[PDB]
Design a protein around this ligand. Structure first.
Ligand SMILES: C[C@](O)(CS(=O)(=O)c1ccc(F)cc1)C(=O)Nc1ccc(C#N)c(C(F)(F)F)c1
Length: 238
């Protein structure tokens, strides 16, 4: 049942709407990445609310959790797409927004892209199955919270424990659990760098001609600073 549900609600392909015949400039690439974030968020919200037990969370906690984990969720899914499509050769953000070495450099996110390709490669090196991927991604949604707790922290804690149990069931083993939890932890440092980069970019967006959609601009200025200031922190296993 659990896996049936995860497979049924998994989001489909999402395009960035990037004009590929235009020069690879910083402004053009990040305006497209920003738009893609706006588009993937829409799918992530519907995905999360359809997750087993998610609705048990307080309404305000639901939105908060989705916004705090959006970056990591997108990174993880992206690494899996790149692995399954181009075999981690390039970064497959969207069918119409694939990053090669030139784009990695022009986006001024080269170092982060390298780490993301490393993650993508892990899917191959660890021979991660579609089921493991699905369970792990669901767990990622429940991996970052306010140090002072959510409105209803007990429900969240209960749910997170349940999802950890499901990952354990899919594996069933100790070596595998060690490897998968290590992989999940590796997403956070990456998300953090993207969060920092995104924040700085928003602040100076008017000077570098980069456009940010409404919802992304709100999340970057309201939720992301909470993470960068230490009020909201990821839940590491190790
Ligand atoms: C630079 C940026 O455009 C910032 S953003 O999308 O507006 C954003 C704003 C706030 C967040 F919490 C998360 C993401 C970005 O990280 N976009 C983005 C778009 C698509 C994908 C994918 N797939 C990813 C990444 F997760 F893979 F890095 C990142």
């Amino acid at each position: 049942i659990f896996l049936n549900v995860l497979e049924a609600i998994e989001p489909g392909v999402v395009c960035a709407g990037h004009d590929n015949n235009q020069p690879d400039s910083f402004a053009a690439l990040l305006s497209s990445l920003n738009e893609l974030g706006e588009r993937q968020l829409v799918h992530v919200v519907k995905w999360a609310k359809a997750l087993p037990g998610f609705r048990n969370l307080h309404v305000d906690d639901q939105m908060a959790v989705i916004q705090y984990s959006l970056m990591g969720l997108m990174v993880f899914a992206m690494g899996w797409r790149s692995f399954t499509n181009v075999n981690s050769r390039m970064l497959y953000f969207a069918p119409d927004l694939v990053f090669n070495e030139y784009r990695m450099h022009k986006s001024r996110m080269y170092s982060q892209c390298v780490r993301m390709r490393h993650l993508s490669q892990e899917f191959g090196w660890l021979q991660i199955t579609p089921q493991e991927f699905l369970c792990m991604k669901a767990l990622l949604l429940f991996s970052i919270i306010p140090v002072d707790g959510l409105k209803n922290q007990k429900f969240f804690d209960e749910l997170r424990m349940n999802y950890i149990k499901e990952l354990d069931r899919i594996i069933a083993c100790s070596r595998r659990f060690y490897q998968l939890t290590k992989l999940l932890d590796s997403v956070q440092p990456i998300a953090r760098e993207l969060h920092q980069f995104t924040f700085d970019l928003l602040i100076k967006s008017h000077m570098v001609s980069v456009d940010f959609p409404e919802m992304m601009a709100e999340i970057i200025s309201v939720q992301v600073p909470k993470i960068l200031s230490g009020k909201v922190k990821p839940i590491y296993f190790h």
